[PDB]
Amino acid sequence: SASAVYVLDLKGKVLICRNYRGDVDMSEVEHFMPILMEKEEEGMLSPILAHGGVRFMWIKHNNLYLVATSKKNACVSLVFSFLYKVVQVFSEYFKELEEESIRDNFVIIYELLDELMDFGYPQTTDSKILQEYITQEAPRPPATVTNAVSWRSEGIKYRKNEVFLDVIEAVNLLVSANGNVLRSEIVGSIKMRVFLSGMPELRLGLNDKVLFDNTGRGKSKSVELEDVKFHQCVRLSRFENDRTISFIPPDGEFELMSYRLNTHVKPLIWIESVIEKHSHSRIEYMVKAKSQFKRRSTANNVEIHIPVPNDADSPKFKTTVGSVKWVPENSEIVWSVKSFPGGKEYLMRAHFGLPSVEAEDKEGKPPISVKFEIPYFTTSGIQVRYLKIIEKSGYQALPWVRYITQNGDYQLRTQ
């Protein structure tokens, strides 16, 4: 139940404001900046502020803070979801989210803001559907918004019927400084870019552990997805009844399902790093990277960030394979490797200087984060089985999909 959705800037100027209820004075935004400054300088800054009886719940964008005032006990989660939908719409309409578009796209921004939410209740958020009634370059609204299917416009015709899938893996690892891994979760993400003719009803089928157990095939390699979050197109009743994944894909690239399950297997990359930090004299970086992944897979663009001293200078890198660059902006040793064959082992021996005078305040120990991205490798073992493309007109679809394995929260706690 937001009161006024506004767009701020990095200096406190309200780039654009659009009140939906009028229950909050338009001059209350002037106190948001001083309140945020007071909160950030005392450690009490929060995305949801409070100006007397008025709360300012907002998120931080690339260059603007999407603040939305409210007064009653509105659903803060609803406000956050509306802000996220607005950010996604802005990203879909404008390729960049900066001040260069707020002062230049006011003609369409006001229309989008007016159409998106009325009286504090958003009603339309489909960027592909919204692109048919509000344009920056108007006919009656499409029947898709009034119709039940509000994510697939009817009458779409293409010369071919190509659906490209993207099974992107997310390897998140939380390795403590003692050498054990605490949080090792794998978050699957099936992102497809559908290009079909008509309103096809895709019937996705994978090698799910629950599906295999129900069929009676609970003995082969089946992914044990603890959490499966389907898109709005996926029918919840069909999935709940017998694990039937039936949904009409939209036109373009979108996130169909987002799997999330834990993993009890050894890490793909083992990072044995040591720190021979002499007191104000020098330091050594005995970093060893052991690839526990399969030797048949190659991790393209391996980037193991090694946080070196913030005041380190005159650095030297004695490594084995891969370029080693020290970035003073990020204050870390960027162990960049282009191609790392599975089972490979690269050894590096860093050595940098240190000022004689000690620092005034502590600097902390940022965790070492690898940036491995191994294509054509599914760690969870989930394999797509079938995709029932059904159309009333009748056509022969050509489904396609690729598996990409990358690093998620692949951090390693330092000593």
Binding site: R203, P375, L398, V401, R402
Partner: peptide, 18 residues
Amino acid sequence: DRKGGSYSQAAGSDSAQS
């Protein structure tokens, strides 16, 4: 070609389960 693994064709349904 494409970085992250070559795209592969998918089936239509579980042909082995009718």
